[PDB]
Design a protein around this ligand. Structure first.
Ligand code: GSH
Ligand code: GSH
Lengths: 220, 220
């Protein structure tokens, strides 16, 4: 049976699960939360351990917590390294990805006065902290993948973040040629290609009106 | 060689690593960051992949990212379940612990005007979302541990959080007898007992002046 993904019809916290399942070549289905009552239904079903989504029905579980879902998917589909040493590298890399992702994820709901400052900070962190660190990993071993010379969730999560960075400002990737190269190679894996092409499961960026709709469903 | 823990002499993001290593019966050492120049030294050493701590030297790695360090320690010392299904439950539980932890962790640096509202929200989440959810897990199987009828990092991380809740307001545990019972059993494991007794590695709560010291070292 295909996993079932419960979320708003948008990127938010479910987008990295879509990318990772897609990258693993796993067909999945989505039940969109379009109304407050769609959300209320999942809570009243007892489906949500913490009264929150993402939730993914997979292998007889109703998994909540984005990290728990990703860890399970990655381990099941051999995208979490070969040994605990490789996992330690993967985990360290993707937790960095997670921190920069979280800043970008919450930009839309930043108090309007400090939004410019927040964009400056994200660009500063992007160019001076995160991308330098990942560029140095690729520089150090000259291999096609971040870890174990093999495709892992680290490649998928980083490449998903490079697309977001490019959407924020394409000049931010200018000084990171090895990361641009990763992005091009990962984008051309058969499974990721289908995911990114027209009609794939990838979600578009939100607008003023998708933000307003999500805010009256989730309260933020 | 004993692991080496690099952090401020305080709880912050390193406290759950201290608990987990202690619970696994692993002797460790700590190099405290007492001054801006202590921090600057780690950055200039190239020790910090993202220019941040926690950092833990263990088994020839300089691991940063609290989750990467915990995932490694838990897997090494057989505290991460027997299979990926048990890890999915463990992960789902501890990610909920992590969300309530994060609210408590940032209380000290909440603007003093909205601190009361923040404490109200934390108590609401504690009594109406998190503790109910963990109480239901123990109720459902009536076993001594949250997962696999066996000690896991889920027990250690939850019992750490129950101590923090008790520090915030002891009446918050009143309606959660099975969680009080877990806290009492876990607190009496030989390794955790030493960790909690006088002269153990457990750190005290911060004060106005430990918060001020950490703020001018880490800029937060
Ligand atoms: N730590 C959780 C965060 C989940 C979360 O914040 N969920 C939101 C939607 S993205 C929600 O359900 N909000 C409603 C609420 O907290 O009541 C995860 O990563 O899964
Ligand atoms: N996601 C990281 C957070 C690390 C973090 O925020 N580190 C702080 C100290 S707890 C720091 O080094 N701050 C200085 C800075 O970011 O420049 C983790 O969980 O380890």
């Amino acid at each position: 049976v295909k996993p079932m993904l419960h979320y708003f019809n948008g990127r938010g916290r479910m987008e990295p699960i879509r990318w990772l399942l897609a990258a693993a070549g796993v067909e999945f289905e989505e039940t969109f939360i379009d109304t407050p009552e769609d959300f209320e239904k999942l809570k009243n079903d007892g489906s949500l351990m913490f009264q929150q989504v993402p939730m993914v029905e997979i292998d007889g579980m109703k998994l909540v917590q984005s990290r728990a879902i990703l860890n399970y998917v990655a381990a099941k589909h051999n995208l979490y390294g070969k040994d605990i040493k490789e996992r330690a590298l993967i985990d360290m890399y993707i937790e960095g990805v997670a921190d920069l992702n979280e800043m970008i994820l919450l930009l839309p709901i930043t108090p309007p006065a400090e939004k410019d400052a927040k964009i400056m900070l994200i660009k500063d962190r992007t160019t001076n902290r995160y991308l330098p660190a990942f560029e140095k990993v690729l520089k150090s071993h000259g291999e096609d993948y971040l870890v174990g010379n093999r495709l892992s969730r680290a490649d998928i999560h980083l490449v998903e973040l490079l697309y977001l960075v490019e959407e924020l400002d394409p000049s931010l990737l200018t000084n990171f040629p090895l990361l641009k190269a990763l992005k091009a190679r990962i984008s051309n894996l058969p499974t990721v290609k289908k995911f990114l092409q027209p009609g794939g499961a990838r979600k578009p960026p939100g607008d003023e009106k998708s933000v307003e709709k999500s805010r009256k469903i989730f309260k933020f």
